[PDB]
Structures are given as structure tokens and as C-alpha cells.
Amino acid sequence: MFMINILSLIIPILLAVAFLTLVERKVLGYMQLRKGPNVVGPYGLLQPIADALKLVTKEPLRPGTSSISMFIIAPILGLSLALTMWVPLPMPYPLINMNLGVLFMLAMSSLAVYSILWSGWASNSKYALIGALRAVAQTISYEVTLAIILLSVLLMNGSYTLSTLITTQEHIWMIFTSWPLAMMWFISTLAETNRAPFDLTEGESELVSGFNVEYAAGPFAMFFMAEYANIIMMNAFTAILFLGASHDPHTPELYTINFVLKTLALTITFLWIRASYPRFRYDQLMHLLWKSFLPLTLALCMWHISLPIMTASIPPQS
Amino acid sequence: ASATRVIQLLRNWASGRDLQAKLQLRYQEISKRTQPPPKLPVGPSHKLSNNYYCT
Amino acid sequence: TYKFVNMREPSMDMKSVTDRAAQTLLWTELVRGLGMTLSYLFREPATINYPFEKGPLSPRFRGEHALRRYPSGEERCIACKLCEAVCPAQAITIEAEPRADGSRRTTRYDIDMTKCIYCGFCQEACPVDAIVEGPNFEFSTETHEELLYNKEKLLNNGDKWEAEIAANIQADYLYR
Amino acid sequence: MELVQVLRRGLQQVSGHGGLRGYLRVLFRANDVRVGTLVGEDKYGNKYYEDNKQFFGRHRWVIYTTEMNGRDTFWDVDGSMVPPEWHRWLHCMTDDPPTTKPPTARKYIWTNHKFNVSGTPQQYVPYSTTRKKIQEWVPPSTPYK
Amino acid sequence: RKCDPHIGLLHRGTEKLIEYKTYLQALPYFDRLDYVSMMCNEQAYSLAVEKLLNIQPPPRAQWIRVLFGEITRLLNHIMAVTTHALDIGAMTPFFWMFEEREKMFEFYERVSGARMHAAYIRPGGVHQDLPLGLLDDIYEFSKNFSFRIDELEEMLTNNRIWRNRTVDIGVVTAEDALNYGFSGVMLRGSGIQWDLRKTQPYDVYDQVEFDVPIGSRGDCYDRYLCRVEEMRQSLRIISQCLNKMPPGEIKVDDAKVSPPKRAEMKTSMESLIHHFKLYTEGYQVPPGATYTAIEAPKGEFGVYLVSDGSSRPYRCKIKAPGFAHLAGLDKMSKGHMLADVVAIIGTQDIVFGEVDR
Amino acid sequence: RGEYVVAKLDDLVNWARRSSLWPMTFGLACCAVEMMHMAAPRYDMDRFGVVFRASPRQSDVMIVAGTLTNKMAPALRKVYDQMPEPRYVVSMGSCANGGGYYHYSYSVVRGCDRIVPVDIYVPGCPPTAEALLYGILQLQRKIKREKRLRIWYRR
Amino acid sequence: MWFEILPGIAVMAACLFIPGMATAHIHKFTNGGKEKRVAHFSYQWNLMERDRCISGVNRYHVTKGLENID
Numbered sequence A: 001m002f003m004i005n006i007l008s009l010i011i012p013i014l015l016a017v018a019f020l021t022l023v024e025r026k027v028l029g030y031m032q033l034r035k036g037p038n039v040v041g042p043y044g045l046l047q048p049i050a051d052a053l054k055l056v057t058k059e060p061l062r063p064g065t066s067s068i069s070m071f072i073i074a075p076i077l078g079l080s081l082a083l084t085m086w087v088p089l090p091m092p093y094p095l096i097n098m099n100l101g102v103l104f105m106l107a108m109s110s111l112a113v114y115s116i117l118w119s120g121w122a123s124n125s126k127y128a129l130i131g132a133l134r135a136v137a138q139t140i141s142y143e144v145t146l147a148i149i150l151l152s153v154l155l156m157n158g159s160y161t162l163s164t165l166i167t168t169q170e171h172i173w174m175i176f177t178s179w180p181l182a183m184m185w186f187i188s189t190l191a192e193t194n195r196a197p198f199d200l201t202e203g204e205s206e207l208v209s210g211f212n213v214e215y216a217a218g219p220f221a222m223f224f225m226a227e228y229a230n231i232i233m234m235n236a237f238t239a240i241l242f243l244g245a246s247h248d249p250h251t252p253e254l255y256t257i258n259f260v261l262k263t264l265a266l267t268i269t270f271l272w273i274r275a276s277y278p279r280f281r282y283d284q285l286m287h288l289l290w291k292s293f294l295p296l297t298l299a300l301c302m303w304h305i306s307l308p309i310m311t312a313s314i315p316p317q318s
Numbered sequence B: 001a002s003a004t005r006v007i008q009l010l011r012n013w014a015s016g017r018d019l020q021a022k023l024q025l026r027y028q029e030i031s032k033r034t035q036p037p038p039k040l041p042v043g044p045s046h047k048l049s050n051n052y053y054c055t
Numbered sequence C: 001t002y003k004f005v006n007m008r009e010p011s012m013d014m015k016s017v018t019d020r021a022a023q024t025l026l027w028t029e030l031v032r033g034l035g036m037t038l039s040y041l042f043r044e045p046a047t048i049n050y051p052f053e054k055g056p057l058s059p060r061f062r063g064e065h066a067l068r069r070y071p072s073g074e075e076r077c078i079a080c081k082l083c084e085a086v087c088p089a090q091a092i093t094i095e096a097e098p099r100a101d102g103s104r105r106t107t108r109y110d111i112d113m114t115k116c117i118y119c120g121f122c123q124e125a126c127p128v129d130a131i132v133e134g135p136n137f138e139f140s141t142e143t144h145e146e147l148l149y150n151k152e153k154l155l156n157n158g159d160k161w162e163a164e165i166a167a168n169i170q171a172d173y174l175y176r
Numbered sequence D: 001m002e003l004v005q006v007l008r009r010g011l012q013q014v015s016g017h018g019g020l021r022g023y024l025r026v027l028f029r030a031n032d033v034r035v036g037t038l039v040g041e042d043k044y045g046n047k048y049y050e051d052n053k054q055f056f057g058r059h060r061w062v063i064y065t066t067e068m069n070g071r072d073t074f075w076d077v078d079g080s081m082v083p084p085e086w087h088r089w090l091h092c093m094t095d096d097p098p099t100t101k102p103p104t105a106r107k108y109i110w111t112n113h114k115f116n117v118s119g120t121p122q123q124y125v126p127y128s129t130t131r132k133k134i135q136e137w138v139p140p141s142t143p144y145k
Numbered sequence E: 001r002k003c004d005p006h007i008g009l010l011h012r013g014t015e016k017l018i019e020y021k022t023y024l025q026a027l028p029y030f031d032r033l034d035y036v037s038m039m040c041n042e043q044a045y046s047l048a049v050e051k052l053l054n055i056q057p058p059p060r061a062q063w064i065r066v067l068f069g070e071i072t073r074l075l076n077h078i079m080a081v082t083t084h085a086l087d088i089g090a091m092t093p094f095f096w097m098f099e100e101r102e103k104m105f106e107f108y109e110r111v112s113g114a115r116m117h118a119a120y121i122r123p124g125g126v127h128q129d130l131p132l133g134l135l136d137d138i139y140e141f142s143k144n145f146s147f148r149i150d151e152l153e154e155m156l157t158n159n160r161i162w163r164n165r166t167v168d169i170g171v172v173t174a175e176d177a178l179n180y181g182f183s184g185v186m187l188r189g190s191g192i193q194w195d196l197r198k199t200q201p202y203d204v205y206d207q208v209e210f211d212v213p214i215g216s217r218g219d220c221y222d223r224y225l226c227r228v229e230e231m232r233q234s235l236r237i238i239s240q241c242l243n244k245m246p247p248g249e250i251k252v253d254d255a256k257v258s259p260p261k262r263a264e265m266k267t268s269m270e271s272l273i274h275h276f277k278l279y280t281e282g283y284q285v286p287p288g289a290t291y292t293a294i295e296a297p298k299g300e301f302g303v304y305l306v307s308d309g310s311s312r313p314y315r316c317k318i319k320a321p322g323f324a325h326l327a328g329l330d331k332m333s334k335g336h337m338l339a340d341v342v343a344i345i346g347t348q349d350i351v352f353g354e355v356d357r
Numbered sequence F: 001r002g003e004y005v006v007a008k009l010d011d012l013v014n015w016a017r018r019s020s021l022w023p024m025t026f027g028l029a030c031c032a033v034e035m036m037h038m039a040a041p042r043y044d045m046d047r048f049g050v051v052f053r054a055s056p057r058q059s060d061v062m063i064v065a066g067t068l069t070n071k072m073a074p075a076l077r078k079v080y081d082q083m084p085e086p087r088y089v090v091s092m093g094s095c096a097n098g099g100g101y102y103h104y105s106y107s108v109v110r111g112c113d114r115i116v117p118v119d120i121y122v123p124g125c126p127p128t129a130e131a132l133l134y135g136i137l138q139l140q141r142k143i144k145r146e147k148r149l150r151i152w153y154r155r
Numbered sequence G: 001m002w003f004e005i006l007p008g009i010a011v012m013a014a015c016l017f018i019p020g021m022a023t024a025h026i027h028k029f030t031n032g033g034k035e036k037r038v039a040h041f042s043y044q045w046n047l048m049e050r051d052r053c054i055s056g057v058n059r060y061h062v063t064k065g066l067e068n069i070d
Ligand SMILES: CCCCCCCCCCCCCCCCCC(=O)OC[C@H](COP(=O)([O-])OCC[N+](C)(C)C)OC(=O)CCCCCCCCCCCCCCCCC
Pocket: A179, A180, A181, A182, A183, A184, A186, A187, A197, A242, A273, A277, A287, A288, A291, A292, A293, A296, A303, C024, C025, C026, C027, C030, C031, C034, E160
């Protein structure tokens, strides 16, 4: 009966990912005083279908210098890990109840760089290769901050079991206990997914296409769908560690909508953040992390690792 | 500009600055596209006398 | 007179340092950047929908050319030739022969539409304002040839756009 | 309290659009669901509207006819379909709709305004309208001396 | 370490085509010379030509000339900062304030009849008069304009990541900027005290109060504050000029250099002959050479036209503000990252239509 | 029958093609500034499902605008060839259309059509944002009156 | 106005609502009314083997109360 849930999980993400592009384009439009796509169907709702299959029906040129095997592998693994990434989400009852689910989340988040690296190298372009190693060096540099912040956060949870988050974050949002790490976690997310102001990996007027470079209908759509698949979920991870909701077993629907709205509102801010702020330079993008975030990250981890022992409030791992 | 007062407070507070009285785009203050006929003046040398070009 | 734009001494009290320390730590000038973005979202967009609406123009607009004619019906173009001597792209081309009666009307008036710049000079040049620039600006095409105008196409524009430019010049000649 | 009249306008929008079918027609064909006063109607079916409250640019608008000069048009909205007399008021070049002040009567004015004809058999093709030069010779008709 | 560009992607005839046209036919060249600020170019060319003819424009015509000259001054600084925002990553700011540019463009359409390439400033005064109500439209826009530039100001100035990407990122010292041909704002942001508006008050500039925005060290940030302050000062030059419009004329009363009024054209022969000859060969400018520069809203814009005692120019080399300010790029980018180069351009104003003379 | 099937499929494909026309705006001169008035809050360019896109690999219509010199000519053709199928180039302005007022210049190629197969000729100097938007709408209808599947079906 | 955004997020939220709703309901349906008993440790696993063995129908989510014992 089970392939049901996999399909009932996967296809909604693709549909949610696709309509984020609409939501992004329209939000940005109103952000910078515009209307956005509104002529292709009612309020542009059919536009996502218009461009998507368009990005499947336009000719997919293979660059002459490109290595076909890697040029195909990079979108495949970039897309594949994002879909598998959604399986342990503690959304009411998680599909995959991996007791180490948070490690599972980080393990797959450390392989999207290969999708960045190979696609940059496979294109075999000077513009691609400087975009690639720069892009990969940015994202794995934010790995250490990404890993430690969680280690501070779940240290009060009890384990890395994602479903346990709803039990720990029952009476209050966990943001009220780790809000110094809140924006610290949140800001690091845009670094990983490469969204403005941390949008050095695209740079439409600077990197023209960034790590996507010479990608068109076909592999590009996967990358665009992949990049807009990670954005939707880092909300869900944020909306699970941080702000959550009750999970009354009699009405699992109550947890659904409440969780969904938070994962919607946060995605707006992701889209909202890109609107205002300028775009980072690489030196500062690395300077902010290694020098303005790491010392802060280490200190909070010490505080969050001694606080439960100080107050005799260690969490139960079971 | 036409929004309700409550949402006007929202954008007013989010900006902290009076966006209602000095809203960006035009409204019923511009000069009517129909205008009275003009009667442009004459130049500084439109005199029928003592006005030789040599002067 | 002059006015300094950058020089400024930051106050160096504990409250001032805390203010600046908070500003860097708890991002307030950053959030202000977000603060007035929402004010822009919750605002009416200025998006003119097209062709349903139209951005305003003036009775002086310069666009598609259209050679007019007298109220009796006769062509205003006298072959006075002045429009060429002023046409700074040399787009127009006028050559005339004595008509059957004798009144000279140009046997060829071919504004190379992809040559001119819509000066208004040709309008300002004509002593009988034969050549005008109609308010139309939506006359794109797909073949480069259809841009290349001629005497007949000019006359058709004059007969098609006739009421508008007659009204526009009627309400604008006083300024001229 | 401020919410109810806003939704009242939203429901009044369907009332002013002649039912749900009319609402969906304008929402798809025009993508502008707005109720405005009928200022005038030209000789093709183009229905013109005006709303003072709307800001400059949305002050006056038009939903085009479904048919004019042969071209069937329901998803074929174009800007060259506006007749010249209404081209003034619609572009807000003058606050005087043609239905109020009609164009000065002339014999040579086109009775039917034409849309953009490019890309179709009746499009335009340039040509030299001068007569000729260098008139040639002509001999009697039996050849070789 | 080394940064020399290669231009000519928009090199065009300009001066070469000018010699075969008359002065009036040469006016559209300056309108299209730079593709950003149109009216201020005709300010230079008309000023240079009227200088050669020893004909001064009527006082009113100067007042419209300055009014639209500063309206275009408002046009220029808007795109330089907002394109810098587009470069620096802020896409929201250039959409907001640019809607305001549609209002001045609408003003351009009302007066000249064209949306951007007005061809309005002519030798011997402005070509045509303002429509009845254009002054009111300026005030309605100007009333809310500072409100819009504050919206630019808040999010594009104190933004922590805008500040660092504009502070210290490229700087020129005093004598170095002076000796690189930098002029106008480029020196003013580097601390040099100089401005063509006041030191050489061309046109009616000696009757309007404004403050030049001299600044600190002179990095990307320094001239950025200078530019926005220029817009605020340009707003007063508008406001002072808006309530000072005198009841005068638009053209000189010398039909030999100014086309006669159309009403008198079809009635008086002297008008008809003068209109005929002026529209066939134009006025003959007395021989000589003259380099006259005005404060462009980008830099020092001068035309060194030489008159052969004919109805056409002989050579009309331009002092392009973009040209001389592109000359400084090599020293301007000593020791900076590759991603900075676009911002290094952004603090300056390099419109590829104007740099090529 | 089969003819109706391919006609519906032809309708569906061109509906996408006449919707997501991501443009290569390759303007160089004062035709370029007036185009942003078509990417304006006044007239939205994004409202017709089209967004100004970099990376010519993913682009459909190339908006060429501004005067075209000989120096730019080699660079314009190479990017055009890099542009994927389908690709349409819209000549904007008098200069790009036939050379314009910079016609007889020694360093201007008369019109972009001499280098690239122009699909839409938008006249203007500058073409007002409405006028060039009208050309985009004209190109949109051109995609509608396309018979790609019909030709393949009736080959 | 800004409310035209809501239809864009409407099919967002509803579509994003269903994976959580589904993976709960089939979880309810598969596990005989109750939810899928989760074995994070060996205790909760060799537990279910006792229930699966004792049901007689080889289904863990089948309960046998006091009516079962003799
Ligand atoms: C008993 C109490 C124990 C704990 C007490 C802890 C101390 C008190 C609290 C301190 C503040 C919290 C921790 C530090 C946070 C800032 C870290 C840092 O380095 O900041 C300065 C850093 C660096 O600033 P800087 O570089 O100008 O200065 C730092 C010093 N130097 C120059 C030497 C590096 O700047 C930023 O972080 C700016 C923002 C970058 C990201 C851009 C997007 C921002 C989006 C904001 C809106 C959305 C917010 C969402 C919030 C979450 C929602 C769920």
C-alpha cells in the first residue's frame, strides 16, 4: 500500500516547488512595486505549468567541451538527494522515522555540493570553473556553523530523532530558548541554498548564471527545481527545531496546517529577504562566517552544553 | 490610496513615515488634459519702430 | 556654498556604544531595510495593463508619419522640399513633376521609417504642415520592407489618422 | 468593520459584470475585473470605461470588441484595434470622449479603422512610385537589316 | 593589478557625421550622444553655439533651460545609484524610484513631444513653450519626490552590506583625481572644492541657491552620499526655479538664428524667407573655435566645436565626462577583487554611449 | 482523427512558447534605457510571464537595441548562435532596424537584419515602452499562428 | 492589490498540506485505526514481534485483550 505515500509525498513537493517560482516572482514584484505574472491564467496560476513544460520542450543543447556523463550526473544527484531529503520530516507522523534523522538531514545536505562541483567542472568553461570552486568553498564553509548550531539546538531535545522535536517544543517555541542561535541558524540557511543576499552562486548580473552556467531546458529545470526544493524544506527544518505546533493525535490535521503555515510564512521571508538587501561579496561572505559567526557559534555551544547541567534540565533521550 | 485605514497603519508603522499624504503615483490633482488656449507673448524685438537689425 | 556629506563623529558613551553594538548584533538598520519593503508590498501597484489601458501622452506626441490634406481634399504636400534640408537622418525623399493641371504634388515621398528619429523637425519645417507625426506608435512589423514607407502609405496614414492629428494640431498650433 | 465593505465591492464586482459568466469572461479575456461607467461605444463593439477614483493610467480603459474588420478576436487583444477618434481619449491625450464631441466631418476619413495588418496577405509592401526614366528605342518588326 | 578596457562597441560617427550636417541638424547628435541624460547635452551644444553667435537667449528661456536641465539632473543620479544597487544586489530599489522617472519622462513628452529624446534645447532659446499646467505637474511630483528618495535612502545607504561594499572599496587622492581629468562630482566626492554650477555660473545659475556635496576620503560610499545630496539640492533648484518662471519668451527675437513663429510664418515674407533659409542651410556661425563646458549630471561635459564661417561645423570634439572618468579606471582599481570592478564602475558613471567621445 | 490531435498538441506547445519568452535584451544605446520602461512598475515585463534572463543558454527572444557598430558585430553573432532553439530576435529602434540616423556612418552596419534573421521590427527612436511592448505582443501572436506540428504531421 | 498573491500560495499551502495529511491517514489505515507504532530502540521492536506473534493473523496492529485469555 506504501508506494502511495512516496508518490503522495514526492509529487506535492514538485508542485510546491514549482509554485514557489510563481510565489517568488509575484512576491518580489509587489516587493519592488510590481504585479508579477498575472496574464497567464487567473492570477498567473497556470504560468508555472507554462514555463515548466516549456523548460522540457525547448532544445537541450549539449556543450561541445562538456562531459556528458557528469553533465547528466550532477542534476540527477542534485535532484535525487533533495527528494530523499524530505523522507524523515516529522510532519505529523514522519514517513521515515530514522532515530538519527537530523544526521540524515545533514548527510544529504553535504552531497549537494557534488551537484555544484561536477556541473561547474563538467561544463568545462572558464566562467563555470571559477564559479564552481568558489560556490563549493562557500557552502562547505557554512557546514561547520550549520552543524554546530543544531548540536546546540537538539542538545536540549534529547537525541537526533526528528519526531521528538514536537515533544520538547510543546509548551513554548524553542526559539524562545535559543533565539541567539535562531537567526544564526536562519542566516546560515541562505548561505547553503545560495539565496540573496548570499546569492553569489547565481549572480545574474555578476556570475550571469553562477554554478548553473550553461544549463537550459532539461538539466537546468532540475537545478532550478532542486534549488527551489531546498528552499521550501529548510523552512520545515526551521519550522521543526524552531517554531512548531501541537500534535494532538486525535486530529493530526491540526499539526498539518499549523506546520504548513509556518513553512509558508518563512518561505515568504526567504523570498522577501532577496528583495531588499544587496548581494554579498565573497571575502565578506567568508569573513562574516569564519570571524563573525564562528566565535559566536562556539560560545553559544558552550553555553547551550553547560546550561542543562547547570540547571539540571538534561533532556530524556528515549 | 483606497486601502482601509488598518492596513494603512500597517504600512505607515512599517515605514514610520507618512506615505498616505505623499503617496507615489498620481491622482485627482494633476492639471486637466484639456487646457485653455494659450496666448504666448511677443519677443524682445517685436517692435514695429526704431528696431533696425543693425541695432 | 557647500555641505559635508560623510564627516561625522560617533558618540562615545556607554549608551552610544551599546547602541552601535546592538545595531551590529541585533540587526536594526538591516530590519529597517526590511521594514519599508512591506510598506511597498502593501501598496497599490502602478502596473498599467495593456492594450486595455494606456500610459498618458500629450497633444504634441511624435510618432507614425501621416501626410494630411486640405478640407476640400487636396494634398497639403507642396513639394516645398524643405523637410529634406532639415531631416538630419535624410530619411525622407521628395521628387515632383508638374501634375496634369500643373499643381506640383510629389511623385515620390518615401520616408524611410527605419531611418528617421521622429524629430519633429520635418513638422516644424513644412510651411503647410503637410507631413505630421501621428500619435500612433504601435506600428511594428516583421519584414524590414514594410517599414520602408512611400507616398501612398503616407497618404493612407493621413486618411486613417485624420481626426486625431487634426484635433491635436488644432489644440497645439497656438504654442507653435 | 472595514473588511465587510471590501468584500462587498468584491461581490459587487460580479453583480456589475452581468453574472458569473460575464465575470469569468473579463477575468480571462481582459484580466482586469473592474466596474466602470460606460463613457461611450464606437462603431466596432469596443466598450470604453472610465473611473475617476482609479489613479492616472487606470483612469480610462477599454475591453475590445469580439469582432472587427473580419479578424475574430477573443484571445487576440491588440493595441492597433482602437479607432483614431477614441485613440485620443483612451491615451488620455484629451478629456473629451468621441461620443461627446465627434470628429470634424471630412469626406476622405476612413470609415473603418484597420488593425495592424503585418504578417497577413493584406500587409504592406514598398515600391517605387516614380514613373520611369530613359525611354528606349523601338524599330519596325522584321529582324536583321 | 592592471585594468585597461577595450571600447568601441558603441563607437559611432558623431563628429564625423556632424561636419556634413548643419548646426540644427547636429542638435539630435547630442541628444543621442549619451543615452542616459539627454537634456543636459543640448545645454552644452546650444550654449556653445549661442556663444559663437554672440546672441543671448531671452531670460525666460534660460529659466526653462535650467528647470529641465535639473530635471534631467534628477534623472541621472537616480540610475547611477540604483544600477549600483542592481550590481550590489539590491533589486528592489531600482524598481521603486524608477517609477518616478516615468513622471519626468511624462513631463518630457508634454513639452517636446518625445518621451526621452526631447530635442528641446535649441540655439537661441528653447524651441517651444511649456503647456498650460506643466508647472503644476512638476510641483505635484516634486512634493513627493524627497519621500521617494528617502525610500532609496533608508534601504540603500545604511544597509550594513551596502556600506562595506561601498566604503574603502577604491579611492583616489586629491592630486591624483585632479590630474586624471576627473571633474564634476568625481572630484567633489574626493574632497576637491570645485563645481561648474557656481564657479562658472553658465545660464541663469547665478540666481539660484544650492550646496555642492563635497565629501570625505572619496570611496564608492563617499560619492554615493554626494550623489543623493545632489538630488536633494537639485530639488531646491527645481523649487527655486518653479516659482521664479518669468513672463518672458522662449526664443531669441533674431529670426536669422531662430525660426519665426508659425503664425507669422504664413503671414510675413521676412518670416517665410528666414524660415526657408534657416530650414535649408541654417544660420551661418562666425568663424572661430570655442570649448564651452557645463556641469553634466555625470561630469564635465564640453564641446570644442570649430566654426569655418559657414552654415555647418568643421570639427566638434566633445569633452565626454564618461571618457575622462573612464581614463582613471587603471589607478582607480589598484588592488581590489574581481567582483569589485562592477562596483568600481558603479561609483563612477560610465555610459557606453557617451565614453566614445 | 489525427489532424485534431496534432492541432491540440500544437496549441499547447505554442501556448507555453508565447508565454515564457525569457529575453536576451542585447541593447547597447538609448534604445536600452527606454526598454526598462517596459520592464517598469508602470508597464510590467514580468506580468506577461517573461523575466529578463541572463545566461544566454536559457533564453528565447533576443531583444537587440541601440546602434550596432562593426566592432560589436562579431560578438553579436556568436551570442546569437549560442542561443537555443527556438530563438527570435526583435530589432528595436531606428538604429538597430535599418541603421537609423547613424546610417551612412563608416562604423555602423545598416540594420541588425544584415547579421541576424530579425523576426520583429519595432520602429522608434526611442520606441516608446508601449510601442515595444506592442511588438512583444505582436511576437506573442506570431507564436500562436505557428504550425510546427502540422508541418511535421503533413511532411 | 496584494491579495492576488494569496491564490499563488493557496495552491502552495493546500498542496504542501497533503503530504503530512496523507502520511498520517494511510498510517492510520495501515495500522488498524491506531498510528504506526515506532521502534526507536530494540525494546519497541521485539515488543511488536510479540504482538505480531500473538495476533495469530501475523499483524502487529491487532489487539487481544482480556477476552483473549482463558
Ligand atoms: C544569558 C544569556 C546568554 C546568551 C546571550 C547571547 C548574547 C546576546 C545576543 C546576541 C545576538 C545574537 C547572537 C549573534 C547574532 C548575530 C551574529 C553576527 O555576527 O551578526 C553580525 C554580523 C556581522 O556584522 P559586521 O561584520 O558589520 O560586524 C561584526 C564585526 N566584524 C566587523 C569584525 C566582523 O552581521 C550580520 O549577521 C548581518 C546580517 C547578515 C545576514 C543578512 C540577512 C539578515 C536577515 C535579517 C532578517 C531576518 C531575521 C530572522 C531571524 C530568525 C527567525 C526565525
